[PDB]
Amino acid sequence: MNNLLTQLPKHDLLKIKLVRWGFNKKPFYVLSVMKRRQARNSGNRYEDIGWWDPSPHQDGNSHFGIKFDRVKYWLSQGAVPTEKVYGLFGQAGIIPQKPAPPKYKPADGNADTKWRPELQKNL
Amino acid sequence: GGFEFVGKVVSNRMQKGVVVAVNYVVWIPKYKVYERRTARHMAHDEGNSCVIGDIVRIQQHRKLSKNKAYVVVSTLKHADVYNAKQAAVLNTERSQNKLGRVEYAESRLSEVQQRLLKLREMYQKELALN
């Protein structure tokens, strides 16, 4: 059914992206090689390369799986990771960490409650 | 599929053209049988001398016209063509002379014996090669 694409794009870029596969307030991500301009959860892919569980477990750590050999192959071909994927690769030691620009905007004071009306009802 | 076919010539009425018939089977999952079907293909004939009834081999080729996308490569069997002049000669030979009951039977026996002897020699050679 979901045959992987073989021909490379001619007018767009390839990227390594995170695909949301969680539940209500229980995120879970899968890393795949997809065309830059598509739907987030589109079935068009070249390969699935890893997974990530951002929440802590009883051991206090987050868990991350990746294909070491295939990550190098797609990086060589020209696939461009997103900002978050760069962070995962940097910490995992696959490639050097990417520096971030300086920030001046006053950070948001309501980040975990601004978008959740249920909490605001109690507030 | 459809790269090569072997079929019979059913039409030579076109200029450097021919139509060839092909047989094939299709699997019917519900009844567990193979169904025999037929198709017609038009091919390019450079020689322009094909005869209806020949067995020929056609091969995939670049499109040449609306309904012609094949080329004739070789002929496996040539169709028989009646020739009045040759038939008349045979009739004259048959009517030239007649033999009796015994003479005809003896001649038939001798001819079979000679054919059998040659066949035995060929078979022995084949065994020697083996």
Binding site: - | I28, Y31, V33, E35
Partner: protein
């Protein structure tokens, strides 16, 4: 059949008709009453059964049986019709749902109130 006969459309799937063709494959249908009267059953039964002639919203006209003891249906009354055949009445293949727009429930009913559109007495 032979193999040749089976290949040439030998077998044809059996077709079965519906029991309430006037419903057009719908669970219910709305209509308006044209005439209200009584009819006598076939042998060996004997009674004066209440029936009404209803024109459905799709334009069809059918005979509907009124269950229960007593009714307030008159001409030009909106009713809801379902499937169901009365065996002793010839030609009646539909029934009127009681308790809906115009039809009311049987007064004094205590058992099987749901099938006759009677609410539970609070007192």
């Amino acid at each position: 059949l032979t193999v040749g006969q089976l290949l040439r459309g030998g077998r044809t799937k059996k077709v079965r008709r519906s029991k309430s063709p006037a419903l057009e494959q719908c669970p219910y249908k709305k209509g308006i009453c044209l005439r209200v009267y009584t009819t006598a059953p076939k042998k060996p039964n004997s009674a004066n059964r209440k029936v009404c002639k209803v024109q459905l919203s799709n334009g069809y006209k059918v005979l509907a049986y009124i269950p229960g003891e007593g009714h307030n249906l008159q001409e030009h009354s909106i009713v809801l019709v379902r499937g169901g055949r009365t065996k002793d009445l010839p030609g009646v293949k539909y029934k009127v749902i009681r308790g809906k727009y115009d039809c009311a429930g049987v007064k004094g009913r205590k058992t099987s109130r749901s099938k006759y559109g009677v609410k539970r007495p609070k007192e």
